């Protein structure tokens, strides 16, 4: 493919967007300006991402291209790449490509980015044996047989219909693999990939992780959203620094106890009641423990370097172990049974404090936390100890704002009334309970929320 006469740029590159780009690249003034093959031969790289290109007709004449970026365009047909055999790197993520047959003979490729396209058939990749980076996620691939001969691969991803990982067996050069959001249950083949450093396998159907035992070079592992329970194998992976096991069925954390390089650990939405095994994990800066079965969180006081912690949706009454965590910047503990927040006055670095759906009645200990930027205190609830029924029963309002002022009830049950500080009923007959609600917008520092709740008063 060679221009034999001076040709207007827009007669070579028929796409409007590509003609405009080429005009600039070739140092011309108008898209109608003429160029020769000697001009086109000088183009060895092209960064043409994000330009709304629909067609690369004309690229076949850029015979000396070695690196191209056509990512984030509207490409469908990629036929003009067929004979550009000097190409070593293609960025072509986020297009509408289905047919990759034009890539079949680009044997000098070392990098090929094709994620977020409409690819099913990857058979045209089978001879691209020089590839070391290949990205195929967010496509509709089910069969990865074409990958079996790609023995220089170091970085790989694919999706989203793969169940059979057998074609990976000989790709022992693999260092970084992402198999998230496929239909994978059987990861036995991964035991062959002893050079793996990073393995991302979120949103699959994995329950057996014994194949990972000998993958001791792993420093990063994500098994978020599978069917894990027995994590005994993880004790072997002493180089782990980042571990994501959220959205599983894990209860026994003992295998994690020696993983002392861990700086990030995600364990939310599991079946954990015992966190004593986490006690020695002092390099942790991020820990997620939400949606478990926690009550005694005392072992957490050891984790002095935490800056991010989640504890929401548990059975915690006593929050004071977190008060040791002086570096905390973001703390989430909604949906527990905490009433006394006075120990949190010690969290002088806190920015985000999420504590809705607890039993908090008094904001005063929080008054000096002026660096707060995000705050949640909505929908508290508690039940008072029973008091004796009597027709003129009265209880004090205990609900106190950060200013120290009582917050007047929003509503009071059974036609009851309020005169600071007392809520008083006038009951005609015995009733088993009375109640009140409160709802008060409040800001602490720059963090705004509605401090609200419902208070139940049983009557004996």
């Amino acid at each position: 493919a060679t221009i034999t006469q001076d040709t207007p740029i827009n007669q070579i590159f028929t796409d409007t967007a590509l003609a405009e780009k080429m005009k600039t690249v070739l140092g011309k003034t108008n898209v109608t300006d003429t160029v020769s093959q000697t001009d086109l031969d000088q183009v060895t790289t092209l960064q043409a991402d994000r330009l709304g290109i629909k067609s690369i007709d004309g690229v076949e004449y850029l015979n000396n291209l070695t690196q191209i970026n056509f990512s984030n365009n509207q490409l469908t047909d990629i036929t003009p790449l067929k004979n550009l055999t000097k190409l070593v790197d293609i960025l072509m993520n986020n297009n509408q490509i289905a047919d990759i047959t034009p890539l079949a003979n680009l044997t000098n490729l070392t990098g090929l980015t094709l994620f977020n396209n409409q690819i099913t058939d990857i058979d045209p990749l089978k001879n691209l044996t020089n590839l070391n980076r290949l990205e195929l996620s967010s496509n509709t691939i089910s069969d990865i047989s074409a990958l079996s001969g790609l023995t220089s691969l170091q970085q790989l991803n694919f999706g989203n219909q793969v169940t059979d990982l057998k074609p990976l067996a000989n790709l022992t050069t693999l260092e970084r693999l992402d198999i998230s959001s496929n239909k994978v249950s059987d990861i036995s083949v991964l035991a062959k990939l002893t050079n793996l450093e990073s393995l991302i396998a979120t949103n699959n159907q994995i329950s057996d992780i014994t194949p990972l035992g000998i993958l001791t070079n792993l420093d990063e592992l994500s098994l978020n959203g599978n069917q894990l329970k027995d994590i005994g194998t993880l004790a072997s992976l002493t180089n782990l620094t980042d571990l994501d096991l959220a959205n599983n069925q894990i209860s026994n954390l003992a295998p994690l106890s020696g993983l002392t390089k861990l700086t990030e650990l995600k364990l939310g939405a599991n079946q954990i009641s015992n966190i004593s095994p986490l006690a020695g994990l002092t390099a942790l800066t991020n820990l997620e423990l939400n949606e478990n079965q926690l009550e005694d969180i005392s072992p957490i006081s050891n984790l002095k370097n935490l800056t991010y912690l989640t504890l929401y949706f548990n059975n915690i009454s006593d929050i004071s172990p977190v008060s040791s965590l002086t570096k905390l910047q973001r703390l989430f503990f909604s949906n527990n049974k905490v009433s006394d927040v006075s120990s949190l006055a010690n969290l002088t670095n806190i920015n985000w404090l999420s504590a809705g759906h607890n039993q908090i009645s008094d904001l005063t200990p929080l008054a000096n936390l002026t660096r707060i930027t995000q705050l949640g205190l909505n929908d508290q609830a508690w039940t008072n100890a029973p008091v004796n029924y009597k027709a003129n029963v009265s209880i004090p309002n205990t609900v106190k704002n950060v200013t120290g002022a009582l917050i007047a009830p929003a509503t009071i049950s059974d036609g009851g009334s309020y005169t600071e500080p007392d809520i008083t009923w006038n009951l005609p007959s015995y009733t088993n309970e009375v109640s009140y609600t409160f709802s008060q917008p409040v800001t602490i520092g720059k963090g705004t929320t509605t401090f609200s709740g419902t208070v139940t008063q049983p009557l004996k």
């Binding site: 949103n203 939400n290 973001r330």
Partner: protein, 103 residues
């Protein structure tokens, strides 16, 4: 504005190696206990130029970076996360999110 958002701080080293896209943090709204939540992001680097440097998986809330970053070119990005129901109704107030590009 916090509402039921649960969001970790976001930082990405420059010159990261693939495979891309790379998971950064998983964003969540605790509104997901009462119905399906769908996530989206807006902002420079998301839906405006440079478009799609950052993306979010609408069902999982996985925020991802799609290409290497360069701190000297752009050192920070300001995005906004959105959380809606299956019926298009916001279940959270949009949350401004800072992305810091590190060493």
């Amino acid at each position: 504005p916090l509402g039921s958002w649960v969001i970790p701080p976001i930082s990405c080293p420059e010159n990261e190696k693939g495979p891309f896209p790379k998971n950064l943090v998983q964003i969540k709204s605790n509104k997901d206990k009462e119905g399906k939540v769908f996530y989206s992001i807006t902002g420079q680097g998301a839906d405006t130029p440079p478009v799609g440097v950052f993306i979010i998986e609408r069902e999982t809330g996985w925020l991802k970076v799609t290409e290497p970053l360069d701190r000297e070119r752009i050192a920070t990005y300001t995005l906004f996360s959105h959380a809606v129901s299956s019926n298009g109704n916001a279940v959270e107030d949009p949350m401004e999110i800072l992305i810091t590009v590190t060493d």
